[PDB]
Amino acid sequence: TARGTPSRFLASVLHNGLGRYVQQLQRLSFSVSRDGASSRGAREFVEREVIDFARRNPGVVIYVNSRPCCVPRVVAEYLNGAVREESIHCKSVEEISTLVQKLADQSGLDVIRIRKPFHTDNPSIQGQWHPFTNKPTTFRGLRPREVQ
Amino acid sequence: KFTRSRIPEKVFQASPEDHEKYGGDPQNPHKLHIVTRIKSTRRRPYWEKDIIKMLGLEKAHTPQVHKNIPSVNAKLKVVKHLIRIKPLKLPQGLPAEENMSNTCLKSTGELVVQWHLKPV
Amino acid sequence: RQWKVTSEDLILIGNELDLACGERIRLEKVLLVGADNFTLLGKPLLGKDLVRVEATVIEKTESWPRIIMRFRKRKNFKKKRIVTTPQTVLRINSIEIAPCL
Amino acid sequence: RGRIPGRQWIGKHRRPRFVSLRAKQNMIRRLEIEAENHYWLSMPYMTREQERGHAAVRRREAFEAIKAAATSKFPPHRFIADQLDHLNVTKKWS
Amino acid sequence: VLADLAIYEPKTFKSLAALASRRRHEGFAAALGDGKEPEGIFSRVVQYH
Amino acid sequence: SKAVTRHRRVMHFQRQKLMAVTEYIPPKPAIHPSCLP
Amino acid sequence: AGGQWRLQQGLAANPSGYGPLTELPDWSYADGRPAPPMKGQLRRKAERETFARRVVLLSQEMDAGLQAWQLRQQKLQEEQRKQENA
Amino acid sequence: SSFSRAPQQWATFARIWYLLDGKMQPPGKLAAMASIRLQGLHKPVYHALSDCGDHVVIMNTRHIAFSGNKWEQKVYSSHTGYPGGFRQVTAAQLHLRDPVAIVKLAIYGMLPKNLHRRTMMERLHLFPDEYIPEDILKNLVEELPQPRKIPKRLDEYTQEEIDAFPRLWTPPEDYRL
Amino acid sequence: QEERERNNQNPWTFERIATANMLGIRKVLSPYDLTHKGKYWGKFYMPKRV
Amino acid sequence: MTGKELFEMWKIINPMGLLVEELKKRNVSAPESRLTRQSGGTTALPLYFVGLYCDKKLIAEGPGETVLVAEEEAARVALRKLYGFTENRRPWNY
RNA sequence: CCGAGCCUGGUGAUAGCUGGUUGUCCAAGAUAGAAUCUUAGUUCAACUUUAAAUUUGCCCACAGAACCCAAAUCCCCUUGUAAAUUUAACUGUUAGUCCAAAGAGGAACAGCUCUUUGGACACUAGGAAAAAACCUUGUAGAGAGAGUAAAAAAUUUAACA
């Protein structure tokens, strides 16, 4: 809910778009279990897909602990220090791939209400409106009902 | 009480002034009606709404094509007030198999076989 | 939907574009373009050769969970659902005009 | 003061509604487009006898298609692959 | 965007209002004489195909 | 209620709009037929 | 606004209906490559194709029925000729 | 622009002192323009939360004029609160007792019925005569025009206008006048 | 009365629109209207109506 | 840097004096300050517009709470447009 | 706390009557009447629901359907459409309000009562002032896009030789 949840103005981190773009997903950390039917999708994912994912995205680093876990987790640390945790418990390989990809595409900052869908540092050209823009002046600058 | 409303045939006898006004030549008459639903089939009898649905006008402001023959004329005479009619007009002849995709309608009842999407 | 944009400004799109992050894109449709002392209006839109609006894709992000509840009183009619639509964030890199006019 | 008896729009006495040029214009529009419909419904193309038996083949074949669609009803097939895919829940690394 | 230009770009909005007024005057000339005259310069339209 | 009543039976709004549309518009010339002719 | 004017001119009442403002692509690669079509334009093209196919089918059925009627009537004439010949 | 943040914000959301002469004008139209200019609708930066209102001054509220028999037909009615405290007074007596009340009530009705109505009415200013205190005829900006133009009297119609206007008919000489 | 109903400038008449049912007004109306077009409403009589 | 304007990054004093020195170096007359418009001079929220005119030629005008703030802001505007750091300038290309 | 005591037990008495009836999401879905010590209920029918078999189902075009003393209806190949009948198994609704129209009763009273044809409501939305029943409008989401629908009452009045 909007009045319950906080908000923010739309913005990009460190002005990522202007210069060279950077994949702002710093680090991933998978926690999967050898056994456990919940971790079968994650195990197949680390078997086959994760290699291609690393080959595609060098900027990101991946850690895999591979320890006993009743629920397999995936952690994502961003440049800002933002931590984003997800539970991949009983998840399909394609859904894991989509999750990891949308994490890579996601920026390192909270998902909350955005007040407006845009942001312009220089919003005004020609000068923004003030009351005296569209009205003329007076000879010698004389107020109404003024003799001298 | 309220029942079906039989229409006299004398209503459907166009006059010369009507001809020269609407631009419809009785000789060499058109073949196809573009029909569009305007009013809600709600607050209307069940026969009216099911006639609409069988003609295929459950969707509003979506022109649908029918023939010009008495058997259909009967239905859309029953449901005149819920629809607007126009004839189909095409200068470019029937769409050839190669121009099946580059077709486009117009508000003027025209159907252009080719759509360059670019001004003169 | 329309926008007015400049250089080095962000824009949000409430749908997916199928463009990986960091890729560039040329926007064709422009209703007008204006400088400090003049403007260029279209009929309706401007020529392709005259303008060149380039943008970059920066982010694909899932929206905050938007709640949808339907309730009717004294009928036991209650149903909730949550939606998350995708967004694509763009940044307009450059705006330039050609001498043709 | 100024009330009217009972419900506002029903009964022997009710609130008097009045017409506006707005609504008059709207309904004249509806009925003139209806007159255009009358004109275009006039001057048909073919007669009863010309339009009698031309689409019978299409109606028949469409109805036989519907009949076939209704008759073609069975349970779907069952597969050993779909049966044994369930064993893959206890997959584990060596 | 009309409001956005009215706020942040008043000169462009003045240009648009002037254009609109000129189109009004062309339409009034047309109401006086519908045809039998050269069509307006801005009232002219672009046809697509 | 009944159709025939002592009072003027208030009619349906569509009917009143119809009756408001249909009236005798007398054909008048542009010029009054006394001052000029 | 202006729907009646657009219709008098022949254009769509709602500018979003058809025309270059909606039918054209909204974006393309900076390399100059053509972008993939949007789903809206694809479904519009598909329904327009079905529309034209239907128009063709209806017209062909009408023409075939008229020709069949004409053939039946000229056969009627020929068979009366046969009758009075017999 | 090239203006600093705070100064530009100040110049944008600044208030303006409009002036009006109600010499033989309708309080209805006067109140309509005053109400829009007190809301701040005329400002393209208007929003109900942001109090973008403006100060307005009226003069010659005593010398206002209605259209029709309003002076006697119109009734301003108010209940003191006690039994029998229902009072009705025509615009005539109401004006004779206070020439400002008519215009201020018209504007009070014109304005929205929110809690900002009272603040905007406080920002409003009224004067029966063409007399203003020093500060609030000094700190002005401009005088917007009147809603209606007043017609001229025979005392005002110059001779050349009368001569340009043609005579329409020829009286018989044998008549008294 | 007959020259008035002949010279009325209004293109639209009760009898026309009711015989045609141009707006589904046969709902609100009676079958008797089809003879008592406008002049009558219950027992009353409107001669000015046409 | 694109976000922050220049006077947010570069503090200064007596901007009118710096302006006078710059204009003297550029060999033009010493400009005079004149309030162009004003509102609420008596009330608690005064507003003034001060323009700087050289040889009957305006370079810049600025709003302000008081006349001093308005004239110093106008000097700031003139400095902006002289040094070419107007917000409406050509953005940094790439 | 005696129209006939209190306690225990049968007794978890019975109650066509009132109240209540526990996680999420989707879909289809208010509907003629007969009998009944029966009208606050139930049984059958009708409507509705699920899964299956089959093919005709709906609108309908000429012709066709009474002497006595009107709007429409029935049947109906075409046509436009895709539903319909049957088989297996239950349930629930079976205490109904307003508007228009044809009528009966009453006072040519009722927001009255009773039948018939239709619409709406009992499902969201805009308007008419708030409003169930009136006018537009339906199939469901996000938009800081757009075109439209129904949608604001007008009236001032009497001279006379």
Ligand SMILES: [Mg+2]
């Ligand atoms: Mg009441």
Ligand SMILES: [Mg+2]
């Ligand atoms: Mg009745």
Ligand SMILES: [Mg+2]
């Ligand atoms: Mg006892």
Ligand SMILES: [Mg+2]
């Ligand atoms: Mg449902």
Ligand SMILES: [Mg+2]
């Ligand atoms: Mg019996």
Ligand SMILES: [Mg+2]
């Ligand atoms: Mg019972």
Ligand SMILES: [Mg+2]
């Ligand atoms: Mg049949």
Ligand SMILES: [Mg+2]
């Ligand atoms: Mg009743």
Ligand SMILES: [Mg+2]
């Ligand atoms: Mg009742």
Ligand SMILES: [Mg+2]
């Ligand atoms: Mg019920």
Ligand SMILES: [Mg+2]
């Ligand atoms: Mg919809």
Ligand SMILES: [Zn+2]
């Ligand atoms: Zn005259």
